[PDB]
Design a protein around this ligand. Sequence first.
Ligand SMILES: CCCCCCCCCCCCCCCCCC(=O)OC[C@H](COP(=O)([O-])OCC(O)COP(=O)([O-])OC[C@@H](COC(=O)CCCCCCCCCCCCCCCCC)OC(=O)CCCCCCCCCCCCCCCCC)OC(=O)CCCCCCCCCCCCCCCCC
Lengths: 99, 187, 284, 58, 50, 206, 50, 66
Amino acid sequence: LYLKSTNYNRFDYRLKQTDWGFYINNNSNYIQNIFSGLKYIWRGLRFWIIGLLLGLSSIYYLMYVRLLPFNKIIFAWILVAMFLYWLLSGFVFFVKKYQ
Amino acid sequence: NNLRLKPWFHWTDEERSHAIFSAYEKRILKSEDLPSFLRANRINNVSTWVFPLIALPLFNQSIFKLGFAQRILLTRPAIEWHCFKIATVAASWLAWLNFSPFYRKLENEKEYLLDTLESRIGINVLDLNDALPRWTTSQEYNRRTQQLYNQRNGFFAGLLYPQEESSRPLVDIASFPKNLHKEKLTK
Amino acid sequence: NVTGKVALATLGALTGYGAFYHYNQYLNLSARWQQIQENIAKDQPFDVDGFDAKVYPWVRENNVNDWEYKLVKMRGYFKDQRFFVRRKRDGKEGFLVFAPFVTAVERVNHRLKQKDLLPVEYSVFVNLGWVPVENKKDVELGGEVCPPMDAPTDSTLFVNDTFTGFNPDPANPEDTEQVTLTEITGIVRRGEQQDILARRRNWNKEGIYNWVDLDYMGKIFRLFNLDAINTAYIERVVPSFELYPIPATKDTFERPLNTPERHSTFFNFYAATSALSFISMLLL
Amino acid sequence: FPFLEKMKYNQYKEYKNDYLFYLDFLKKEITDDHSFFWKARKVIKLPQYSVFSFVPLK
Amino acid sequence: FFFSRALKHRFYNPLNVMTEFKNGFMWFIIILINIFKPLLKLLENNYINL
Amino acid sequence: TASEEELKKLYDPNTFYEHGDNPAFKQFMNIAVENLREGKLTDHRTYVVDTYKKWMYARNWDDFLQRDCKAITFPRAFALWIVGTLGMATASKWCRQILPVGSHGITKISQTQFFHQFGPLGTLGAVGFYGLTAYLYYKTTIFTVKKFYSHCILQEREWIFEQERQNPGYGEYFFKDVPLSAEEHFNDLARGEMAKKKFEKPNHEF
Amino acid sequence: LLLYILWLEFYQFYHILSFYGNINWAFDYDEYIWTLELDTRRTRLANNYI
Amino acid sequence: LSFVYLSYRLAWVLFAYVLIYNHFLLGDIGKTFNVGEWDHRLKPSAERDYPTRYESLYILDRTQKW
Ligand SMILES: CCCCCCCCCCCCCCCCCC(=O)OC[C@H](COP(=O)([O-])OCC(O)COP(=O)([O-])OC[C@@H](COC(=O)CCCCCCCCCCCCCCCCC)OC(=O)CCCCCCCCCCCCCCCCC)OC(=O)CCCCCCCCCCCCCCCCC
């Protein structure tokens, strides 16, 4: 598939147009490290699959047993989510700043 | 009378198909009312997945040999020619799906079945409708009706699938006890 | 080759054993059916009256096999509800019709003026007859199965019975104790069981019934003596002549699933299979 | 407010799960099934018409 | 929800919208054709295998 | 012949029709006698017992645009179409940026960094995203064209919306000359006439 | 351990909030059916304060 | 950025709605407000326990639970 394929990608020319000395241009074939984005995607969602499965199943069960009206409760949950998230985001900002 | 609004004047195709399927499943519609409608249904399927095939060479003989098409073919890359052909065929396919003689025949057969239902149960035909699943389609409900017809009007009826003849007990529903109370929970 | 011979020998042995078992069952069933036919032709019904009408002899001694296909006679009032079980009689599709039959009533209320308690009714299921699928709509709710029993000629018999609790009084001063008694004669038969391969399977939710499930029939009709209902049921047999349901007679009462004809068919199938297996083994 | 009372359809809720006697229910006299009737709010002396329509104009 | 992201690509200009529609449809067609050509490759492989 | 004249006036098109209102009022009485049989309003609503088979209760995208977004009029439909056009253009640009095929001379999906990193799964995801966006845009375009044909060509309106437009809440427009102005000014003969027919009795042949 | 304490405290909290709706079964001897009845509750005020 | 922008747009629009409705559109409560409600599963389904914008399509009910 990559017999006559050049090394550079679009990002390589974009990098050659920038003063980013910390990034360099690839000079070898990418066959060795092909499909590494899937590896990093797995690593990103690795600790979240089991927790998300349990949490989403629990949330759906708790909604289903009570048959709550989806629009009203989703509006309420969006409001509560914004409330809690902005509180926790302010606290995360403080934790990060003081390093 | 064409001025009287039928009870299903607002139903979608999925709702009409589900109403027919529920009527057949609940033994309100017999297997003697389906054979026409079902037949039309099958034709409609063949009218959907064959049309692009039928429209592929015909355009090659009629539309894609015209001046505008030849100009596109000769003065634009082959990918743009493929894009033009696919877009034309897809637009024709969408127009066929919206306005198809066999689709009209299927809708007429469903309307006849709904008229039979209204003649049988009266205004309670509206009780056959529900809140359908979002991604279940009219074709899917028609296929379920066809499957139920094959199960009842064939082998294994009474062995793997319930029979079409009901054997419900003969009681007086005015006096027979009911499962649900009017307001409270009962045990 | 050798594997084929081994498979043929195993199949032949199994099918020969099946044929032998079915032949012995056919002999036993034919003998028992001849005995049953002779006993029925004797025509001496057992009168189920008094204590026997409250707790039945096949429930008290728990011997339904000793009381199977057995002529009995009992009096009571049928309840309105009817139950239909899909069945074929004489090779045409139809329904067996079952009705509750209250053979004894028990009153346990002592605050008669203050409270009007419902009586405790002891009932058994009676197979009224067979109605074709065309005429299932002709079965009427609360129909008259049999003409009501004649009033007794003994003036002392117009009181509530000691055991059954029935008053044979056409004009009863106690309106709440007024009963009409009809006297039926039938044969005690046992209940049926599920056999999917025999196409006797019932979908309770859909209302399709193919075999007599006495437990479910008792539960759905909100009857009381569920065990005495599950033990057996009485198939009504008219004396000589049989409009819907059509009652069974001495020669057309509903045949059980296990029949000498069925076992003969199974024996023929298994014997043919064993003979073919042995012929193929000899050829190989 | 007649469009709000869902007790009007409670008889239909029984057979959403117990299909057994649904067909017996369907063979019933139709009285107010899926229909709204507004009783007369005015005295109308028209003997020619047996029943009058007081459905809201909107 | 859609104003700012379209504003970035200057989609308030009707010409840019038409050009983007044409290019996006061509991109979709290219992807589908490149997906379905391996079927022809497998057909030729099946011929040689036969 | 007074009763005959009154009935003929009831069936006159200029009786229940005022300009700026529903043109179906030109044949109002006829329609009424076909629908308000026995004085009863048929309830076309569906009785639903919840099993959580639906959340949005929108049957299709047309229902969503008509009811959830309340694009009852044509200007609203065209505004939603403009929003959908911007969204579709943005989605097309995003898909062409993430999988640049046909942009810089690239002709194969293999020769993209997106395919190098994520492979065919990423291409499938991008195709699904573009297909969903194009499907929704097509549905929105069909809705907008239908609303343009109805409201602008056929001069149809959302007539309850028009009624709400005419009276700004607290106006004094209860007139004797207008039978539909109020409940007191609707003549009793019309009420009797619109309820003369009777419903058919179903034959319970099942 | 904090998860364990959270479950215990939530269990007690749920019980306490469940006190204030008196849900009982009432027998209707006329209809021979039990029904679920909802009612208020009366209790010593110290219980409400705690 | 999706969450950030969603939060900010919703906040601004809903706050504008609150101010405008509570200062300018209280003459007709029926026009500018909808009546909504949902109750416990133990109690029978509320009169206002229906999906809004579909009052002319569906009648929503549910079985009681305990
Ligand atoms: C087993 C396989 C496992 C995985 C294998 C590996 C897979 C790899 C490939 C994944 C997919 C690749 C294709 C992605 C396409 C987009 C690419 C992109 O970067 O877009 C730019 C976009 C943001 O770009 P930006 O310039 O930075 O904008 C910043 C803000 O977003 C600006 O926000 P804003 O508020 O300013 O703008 C609002 C709105 C503006 O939106 C727009 O401008 C256009 C959006 C569409 C609008 C359509 C409108 C239609 C007309 C409506 C008209 C009527 C009115 C409507 C009224 C109501 C409106 C609400 O923007 C958005 O909505 C942006 C978010 C879009 C997220 C899309 C996520 C799904 C993509 C895949 C779908 C797959 C479908 C099925 C496939 C299979 C089929 C057989 O990127 C993202 O949002 C990144 C996250 C999403 C990308 C995919 C991430 C995948 C991660 C791994 C998944 C693993 C499995 C699932 C579990 C995941 C757990 C977390």
